[PDB]
Amino acid sequence: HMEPVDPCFRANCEYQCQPLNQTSYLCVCAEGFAPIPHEPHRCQMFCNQTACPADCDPNTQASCECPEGYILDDGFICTDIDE
Ligand SMILES: *[C@@H]1O[C@H](CO)[C@@H](O)[C@H](O)[C@H]1NC(C)=O
Ligand SMILES: *[C@@H]1O[C@H](CO)[C@@H](O)[C@H](O)[C@H]1NC(C)=O
């Protein structure tokens, strides 16, 4: 199964890699999954604060995402009406 480890294709992206590109390679996740409180790879998700809460949408509820990821359940959380 193996690995040239790409660069990445292994890296050890919790999720995964770009690979690279200016990062040279990083690690992705589901790409608003992104460096939680800590390690330079992680997701969990992105929730760059001042909270994200919860408070999903109005209308569509595509929403409250992160389920999958979860593990939810602060608020409900994980979406930043923020900016
Ligand atoms: C890096 O940029 C090049 C084009 O310049 C292209 O291969 C792609 O957009 C990027 N590579 C990755 C990591 O997908
Ligand atoms: C948002 O800020 C937090 C810490 O304040 C940090 O993880 C990162 O710099 C930004 N993005 C994410 C994924 O949190």
Curated annotation (Swiss-Prot):
Expression sites (tissue/organ): Endothelial cells are unique in synthesizing thrombomodulin.
Cellular compartments annotated: Membrane
Disulfide bond sites: C8-C17, C13-C27, C29-C43, C47-C52, C56-C64, C66-C78
Sites carrying sugar chains: N21, N48
Domain EGF-like: 4-44, 43-79
Lineage top rank: taxon: Eukaryota
Post-translational modification comment from the UniProt entry: N-glycosylated. The iron and 2-oxoglutarate dependent 3-hydroxylation of aspartate and asparagine is (R) stereospecific within EGF domains.
Physiological role: Endothelial cell receptor that plays a critical role in regulating several physiological processes including hemostasis, coagulation, fibrinolysis, inflammation, and angiogenesis. Acts as a cofactor for thrombin activation of protein C/PROC on the surface of vascular endothelial cells leading to initiation of the activated protein C anticoagulant pathway. Also accelerates the activation of the plasma carboxypeptidase B2/CPB2, which catalyzes removal of C-terminal basic amino acids from its substrates including kinins or anaphylatoxins leading to fibrinolysis inhibition.
UniProt disease link: Thrombophilia due to thrombomodulin defect: A hemostatic disorder characterized by a tendency to thrombosis.
Subunit structure: Interacts with ITGAL, ITGAM and ITGB2. Interacts with thrombin/F2; this interaction switches the specificity of thrombin from a procoagulant to an anticoagulant and antifibrinolytic protease. Interacts with ANGP1 and ANGP2; these interactions significantly inhibit the generation of activated PC and TAFIa/CPB2 by the thrombin/thrombomodulin complex. Interacts with PF4; this interaction enhances generation of activated protein C. Interacts with HMGB1; this interaction inhibits HMGB1 inflammatory activity.
Free-text comment on this protein's domains from its UniProt entry: Extracellular region (481-515) contains a binding side for alpha-L/beta-2 and alpha-M/beta-2 integrin.
Protein name: Thrombomodulin
Species, as recorded: Homo sapiens
Gene: THBD
Whole sequence portion shown: 362 to 444 of 575
